[PDB]
Write a protein that binds this DNA or RNA. Structure first.
Ligand SMILES: [Mn+2]
Ligand SMILES: [Mn+2]
Lengths: 189, 187, 185
DNA sequence: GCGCTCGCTCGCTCGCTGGGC
DNA sequence: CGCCCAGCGAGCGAGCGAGCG
């Protein structure tokens, strides 16, 4: 049961959108669910609002092309350094590596149309599948589930902004630092 | 007119029933002076298929039917192995690997019933280095007299060619001995 | 901020090498130069100028660093005319310099030499950390310029080019060269 | 030093794949 | 049903350079 990784960068500005009027980005207030132990004040809501649409729309489209509704996914939204970015992990089922690119460009175009009103973002490499090499000419990387505990779960605030999954073992972990800490230590095994 | 070299290992391998490997009896053609008793027939039977299927496929990918080749099957200390020499025409070095895998796969399907052989490095193109990162080697015709023709029994098992100058030499020790000595006469 | 060094040799034979365009450019020292125009050989300089201009055009393409720092000095050596090209390492990892420099080398041959490789032994050579085989591509820092390039005087010094602010004046000025050498020491 | 070794790098090649039209 | 062509990615091999003796 392997995963492809797509990294999607998210800015702080957007089209259309402006603070002087009502828009879909600014109108959304976010709340942590009861079972979260995170600090809402370190979570930047406008970028999170955009991220949520992007991953929701990504997975809707993904399910169309893969013909696998119920495909397993783990999505984590992060604040770098330079850019906000989302790691999207999506199960390979229904999408042979040979054919991922032609499908991801359909999804990429759809996201531009719907979220960005037809205007491609100017962020440098804003929609990028993870390859087996740093340079040109590698294969689309397939990572197994252990990527999540090894690389995603350890992230803490404010780098960690939000996460989403339909994987049972990680539902609790998405927004719980203590549960993240537990699965990380339980994975060293 | 240069050659690529592919070395294909063949194993020493059911006896309770009829199969294509065991059913074949081999005989030396009349013009051969070799000793049939030093030739191991089950491995030779497999080798013949491998080289026949190799060259059928090679012709497809090269678009050169009538491509020149020399194939020699040998018994080493460890493994039986065949040296396949095939003319470079139609197959740039950049592109040899992608084509040889297609051939390798076809051999596994047809001869090995889809089960890859467990022999260590059983299908190996000759490179310009012993390690990784060299080029595909191109040898000219003189490789045959220098390195292939001198082999004698039981190291020499069999050979095949469509090169007019070496037809006689395949299975004739005296003719091998002659072309070897005639090749030094040229140096 | 380090530099790779490429040494490019340039041949002596206006004529009759049959490449007559080296004769057709007249050179002038800019006003601020104190050099003697009569000790500057213009046909070889004419070629050298094209070589370094084209080298740096190509260097920018492969490095993806327009505005890369460089210092180029053209010399009349004991054996050949040659230019020392110093170019900033940015954008070009040492592992990959060779594959890029051959592209540049081939470009120069096509464009300056009309496809005919020069017969000068070793005419396009990166500086290594050893005299023999098996060393690394050398990285020198800026101080190479004052220590080894700036002291050269006429007629060994023929010409220089740079986009480094501190050395603009020094390219064609012996007094300014003399000053930066003493200020460095 | 100095000639050589050999595991490794990565920009680039180009026949193949298979949705879209 | 047959082309188109963006995506594919193993294979390529000159170049690399610490290490060896
Ligand atoms: Mn042998
Ligand atoms: Mn010098």
């Amino acid at each position: 049961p392997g995963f492809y990784e797509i990294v999607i960068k998210v800015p702080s500005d957007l089209d259309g959108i402006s603070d002087s009027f009502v828009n879909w980005v600014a109108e959304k207030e976010w709340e942590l669910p009861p079972d979260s132990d995170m600090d809402l004040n370190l979570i930047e809501q406008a970028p999170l609002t955009v991220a949520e649409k992007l991953q929701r729309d990504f997975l809707t489209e993904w399910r169309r092309v893969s013909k696998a509704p119920e495909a397993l996914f783990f999505v984590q939204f992060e604040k770098g350094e330079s850019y906000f970015h989302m790691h999207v992990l999506v199960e390979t089922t229904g999408v042979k590596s040979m054919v991922l690119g032609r499908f991801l460009s359909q999804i990429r175009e759809k996201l531009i149309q719907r979220i960005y009103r037809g205007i491609e973002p100017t962020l440098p490499n804003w929609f990028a599948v993870t390859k087996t090499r740093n340079g040109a000419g590698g294969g689309n990387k397939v990572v197994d589930e252990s990527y999540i505990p090894n690389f995603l779960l350890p992230k803490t605030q404010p780098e960690l902004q939000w996460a989403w999954t339909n994987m049972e073992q990680y539902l609790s972990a998405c927004l719980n630092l203590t549960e993240r800490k537990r699965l990380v230590a339980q994975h060293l095994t």
